[PDB]
Amino acid sequence: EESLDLDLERSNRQVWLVRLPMFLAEKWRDRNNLHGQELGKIRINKDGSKITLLLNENDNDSIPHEYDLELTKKVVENEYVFTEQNLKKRDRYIPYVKTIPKKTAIVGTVCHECQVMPSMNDPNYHKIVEQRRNI
């Protein structure tokens, strides 16, 4: 029923791939979370070249409320986010190839590769330093 050809419409959306520290990734990658609630705020210079993250107080002050975001690659090429789901239910050529069709659509273009690092000056920070030291 659905068109087998992928959608090319949703491509034009910039995407920021973020490498995330283990403690924070454990929380955010949880499926129990992700209800749509806001989690943190971002700060961008008018001059640019410096990005820091302002985490909301929902963290229960067990982790830093401020982080610095460093663009590992300011310019990014040939990296995109495509989404997948189930579909509704010498000149010799090979007739049978066993195609398997899925519903697919490309939804964004990656433009900024950046990593979240805890700001050592943060008062709640440097605690995860001892936590990582123990482990």
């Binding site: 910039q14 499926r31 992700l34 806001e38 995109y80 986010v81 964004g108």
Partner: protein, 194 residues
Amino acid sequence: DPNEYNEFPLRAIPKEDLENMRTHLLKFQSKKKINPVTDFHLPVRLHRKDTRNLQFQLTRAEIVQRQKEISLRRKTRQLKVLDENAKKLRFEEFYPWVMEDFDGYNTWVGSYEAGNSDSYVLLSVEDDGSFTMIPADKVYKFTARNKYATLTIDEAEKRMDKKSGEVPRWLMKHLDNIGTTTTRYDRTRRKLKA
């Protein structure tokens, strides 16, 4: 702090929206920048297909043109354990991801690398200014194929046999003069001409 910045709390994607929907990361290996919307000839189809004899496979335009023209057990067994997620991953990767445009000009074959799929998290700015938080389950890497009209396996096996000390330095040139195994784009162009 003095308002030298744009502040806005990023908001998560709704939970109920996420389920039954899978989001993956796409990668191309190419020195030159490639834009899928412009370079590729729509319609573009993404299928999970067997990659054996990719050259012999007909183009989507070629397929459409062809369609239009037509119009005792041992009873005792023990199975070693394997992780269910690993089994599912193996089943999914049994067939590679293969993407083609209608023209057949550019073809790309994906592969799965598990190096950093778990740690990486997706963030793209929403229309309102929020940043959409997506756990990235898998990351796929696509490579170009058949652009240079590759030679087939059997003749390669014959060549590697030490019949000659060195293969002809112009063997590819002679084959191209014979035009054997034309490119999928070339085959599609020939079919369109016919």
